[PDB]
Amino acid sequence: RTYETFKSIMKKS
Amino acid sequence: KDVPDSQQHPAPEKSSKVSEQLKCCSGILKEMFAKKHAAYAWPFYKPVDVEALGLHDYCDIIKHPMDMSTIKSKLEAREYRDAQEFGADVRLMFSNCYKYNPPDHEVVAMARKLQDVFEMRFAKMPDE
Numbered sequence: 001r002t003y004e005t006f007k008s009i010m011k012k013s
Numbered sequence: 014k015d016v017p018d019s020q021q022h023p024a025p026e027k028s029s030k031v032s033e034q035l036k037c038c039s040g041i042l043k044e045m046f047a048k049k050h051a052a053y054a055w056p057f058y059k060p061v062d063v064e065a066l067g068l069h070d071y072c073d074i075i076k077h078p079m080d081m082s083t084i085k086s087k088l089e090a091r092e093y094r095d096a097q098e099f100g101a102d103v104r105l106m107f108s109n110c111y112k113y114n115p116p117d118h119e120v121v122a123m124a125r126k127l128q129d130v131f132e133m134r135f136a137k138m139p140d141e
Contacts, residue, residue, distance in 0.1 A: 001070055001073065003070050003074065004070070005068050005069060005070050005113075006066070006113060006114040006118055006120075007056060007066040007110070007113060007118070008066040008067050009066075009118075009119040009120060010119075
């Protein structure tokens with residue numbers, strides 16, 4: 001698929 | 014001892030440089046594994062958790078997710094055919110960062126920075 005994601009780093013939100 | 018049989022294995026029976034290198038590699042990766050590179054190696058100290066980071070695309074990208082710990086562990090596991098197996102998956106782990114993520118990304122940010130340390134490390138390895 002389209003690379004919408006990345007290796008999410010540190011839930012700062 | 015002193016054998017010209019270097020087709021299937023570059024090594025004698027195994028490791029004339031390798032395990033010395035790996036041992037280097039480990040001190041080099043475990044260097045990266047130091048809480049200094051852990052500003053920039055810690056997404057690497059451990060594997061990609063694709064169900065975690067929210068990947069799901071992962072298996073498109075990341076065939077062979079490498080991480081410090083893994084090239085560290087394989088290193089120490091002595092899967093490392095040598096350092097060039099070390100720096101292979103250090104960089105492959107640097108790769109899984111670049112392949113998946115944009116090159117401005119934090120993980121990739123480590124990878125390039127770990128690349129300062131790792132490759133400098135790697136270069137001070139044996140070879141002789």
